[PDB]
Design a binder for this molecule. Structure first.
Ligand SMILES: Cc1cc2nc3c(=O)[nH]c(=O)nc-3n(C[C@H](O)[C@H](O)[C@H](O)COP(=O)(O)O)c2cc1C
Ligand SMILES: Cc1cc2nc3c(=O)[nH]c(=O)nc-3n(C[C@H](O)[C@H](O)[C@H](O)COP(=O)(O)O)c2cc1C
Lengths: 439, 437
């Protein structure tokens, strides 16, 4: 029960017993059951909203609220998508409707009006003249300028715009300028971008300290650490560099709680440190955005990377040589270009106006569907098409597996998300105490 | 004071701090000299240099370091050219080099076994005492396993049949590991994470220790990402017996690289590096971390790899893109640059007319070589094509030294930056015991 790792103030404000968060996994892989189990142990999970329709997100919220009815910690992810700010306002209104008091903001480059509106809800000032937030944000960042934005107060450009539209009140807009754009930050390194936490984490920790003496807020902003945390040594290293809390993703996919196919959870059980690869990202494909995926038992990383090299080498979709055109339609997708396009015009016929106009966009959405298809096939059951499975994963799982090798935890069916976190947290504190003295 | 006590004694160090090699002599003789006087171990950058420049550097270091001061030599592995390896080990034995940094090896080789065998002996107590030592630089489990395990008896038995080893040296070599020590290298040419890798290799060393039961313990080093007191503190906390630093050392008075590059390097940040294709194993998608701030080299080098996988022939490149390579990337035509590579070897030009892929492969490999040479040169304004190897560690170091007099590369001395790094790492570990608890 000791749990002396991380910042004491962070645990109080979020209602935790351990300064341990479990990051989101898309399409509900970070399930309602996952959060429920973390909430009962005083740990903070984030529901995987990305990809899901509002129907499934709304259902997951009420499901959690009726089990977690004693102030237990739970949160929701909110992934930034550029042209879909219509859904951002909907999700924040839904989060305010279902009393979600913490969100994980990811893929943001700047703070937005819906994020400002979220923090503003039930915002108030105490008798002492200090701004007390009701709803909190933990921005997951990988770059200095983004971290800087979220550590700095919200842009007046947006706060003033919001008052003209009645979304904020002058009392709220003044209180928002006296607090950071996000309540806390997470530094992401090798998530399932590709920079090391060892070179990054000391910088962001100093940047937080710089922003603290500059803006002079009431309470401290806490810096989290994510990407590569799968063992007591990994977490101990993060905490030693100055992390106020830790965060894990890759491990949590290999548990009873996570919503992914059982074969995938079994493939995940036997992965090693060198069984991952950098594939192109679905959301920001054309810009060379990478995604770390599973390599053991799947051709998806090679096949996905091959689709990117052809997008850059050819401008039109029809300019692909006959020799290579046939292999994509037969074994990658298992469907021709025209029948794939016929299904994609069915949903959103609007985009077809752009596909007819621009031959690059026509090509782009076809290859983006291979990445979607791969993710969906991994989530499905009773399917022996493991060659196209896209399973987001990092070396941290491989490191975790190696650490648990020999114990009863080798099988995923004995891995409970709360007990793996509890063990990780307790061995980390045991190692720190030990290693520091054994100098 | 920090690290493994036995490692410092066997290599004659005051600090368990090594400085990795930097190709084409960038890890200069002067650097090794300055590190040797502070009780730190530097490895001379032999890669790319001809034997005359390596031989000259050796005698230069011996003329200055004769008080048993620590210095070593790098040795990379090239399968196409084994004679270069043989000659270098004979040169290292000629000039009394007692420690070597083995890189890009997948298996221990006859020249490495011959190196450890020189002046090898057994004490009165019946324990094998090595004269010449190897520190293998590995990034993979199977390679680390090989070097932790004793030398393959088949290479050792074949070496006896050719008179390279004796009957008693061959027995002594089987009772000791293939390399005296290991360095786990991550991120720096690989995509590996020191946080996920280091705990494994430390356990693998322990497994190999109880298995083979050698006399003396094998020490595990840590390289890739160490540019600050908390990076090193993290490595030492994960079980590193010593740490190694490369990117930071390139930005010091002692390193042999152009002053403009040292100025470029002084202002780099954590996000100012990029993964470009490697000179060696280019076709296989092997990556190399390079400088991004001020150079177009990472983009231009990566574009050449896309062109190689796209087409089959060098002449099949469309006219629009064919012209920009011959004028912006380099200042020679495809036929003209082929003439530049006549001097090195005519027999490889035979294979080029035979295979049209090999023809374009060696052309794109020269862009990478040209980029490296242009960075080393002075009076340079060809910054656009400079290939400067670097990692986020330099950016992290710069941010740590921001505000102090060490901000300029002229105020930075390789021994004092290492001394400070190690002094503050010690301080950080000791003080955080009281801080977090
Ligand atoms: C299956 C999977 C799905 C993920 N999906 C998302 C996502 O939708 N949103 C997000 O913010 N992070 C996502 N992540 C990243 C994690 O939340 C976490 O920050 C990261 O994996 C930490 O790195 P680690 O895996 O090395 O511990 C995902 C990770 C995995 C393994
Ligand atoms: C300029 C430069 C050149 C390098 N050349 C070599 C080389 O020839 N051989 C080698 O084994 N390592 C080489 N390295 C790797 C370093 O010796 C070292 O392993 C590593 O860079 C340490 O990590 P750091 O870059 O994060 O400080 C090079 C690194 C740099 C910065």
């Amino acid at each position: 029960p000791v749990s002396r790792l991380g910042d004491q103030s962070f645990k109080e404000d979020y209602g935790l017993t351990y300064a341990y968060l479990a990051g989101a996994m898309h399409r509900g892989i970070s399930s309602a059951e996952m959060l429920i189990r973390l909430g009962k142990k005083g740990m903070l999970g984030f529901f995987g909203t990305a990809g899901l329709p509002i129907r499934e997100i709304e259902q997951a919220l009420i499901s959690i609220k009726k089990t977690l009815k004693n102030g237990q910690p739970y949160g929701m992810n909110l992934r930034f998508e550029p042209d879909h700010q219509d859904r951002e306002k909907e999700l924040i209104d839904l989060y305010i409707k279902h009393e979600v008091r913490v969100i994980e903001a990811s893929s943001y480059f700047s703070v937005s009006a819906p994020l400002i509106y979220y923090k503003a809800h039930q915002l108030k000032i105490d008798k002492s003249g200090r701004v007390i937030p009701h709803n909190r944000i933990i921005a997951k960042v990988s770059r200095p300028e983004v971290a800087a934005a979220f550590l700095s107060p919200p842009p007046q450009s947006i706060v003033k715009r919001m008052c003209q539209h009645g979304m904020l009140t002058e009392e709220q807009a003044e209180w928002l300028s006296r607090i950071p754009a996000a309540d806390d930050i997470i530094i992401e390194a090798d998530c399932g971008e590709q920079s090391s936490l060892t070179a990054m984490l000391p910088f962001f920790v100093k940047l937080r300290d710089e922003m603290m003496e500059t803006h002079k807020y009431a309470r401290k902003i806490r810096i989290g650490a994510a990407g590569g945390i799968g063992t007591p040594e990994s977490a101990a290293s993060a905490f030693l560099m100055g992390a106020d809390f830790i965060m894990t993703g890759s491990i949590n996919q290999c548990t009873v709680e996570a919503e992914t196919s059982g074969f995938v959870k079994e493939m995940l059980s036997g992965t090693g440190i060198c069984d991952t690869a950098y594939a192109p990202s679905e959301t920001l494909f054309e810009f060379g955005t990478k995604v770390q995926v599973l390599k053991k038992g799947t051709l998806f990383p090679v096949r996905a990377n091959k689709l990117f090299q052809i997008y850059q080498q050819y401008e039109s979709l029809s300019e692909i040589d006959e020799k290579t055109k046939i292999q994509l339609e037969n074994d990658y997708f298992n469907k021709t270009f025209d029948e794939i396009y016929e299904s994609l015009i069915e949903k959103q016929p609007n985009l077809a106006q752009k596909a007819e106009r621009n031959q690059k966009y026509k090509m782009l959405l076809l290859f983006k569907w291979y990445l979607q298809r791969g993710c969906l096939l991994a989530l499905e059951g009773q399917e022996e098409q493991k060659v196209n499975f896209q399973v987001h994963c990092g070396p941290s799982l491989g490191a975790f597996n190696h650490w648990v090798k020999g114990t009863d935890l080798e099988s995923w069916r004995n891995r409970h998300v709360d007990d793996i976190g509890e063990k990780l947290m307790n061995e980390t504190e045991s190692l720190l105490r030990r290693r520091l003295d054994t100098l």
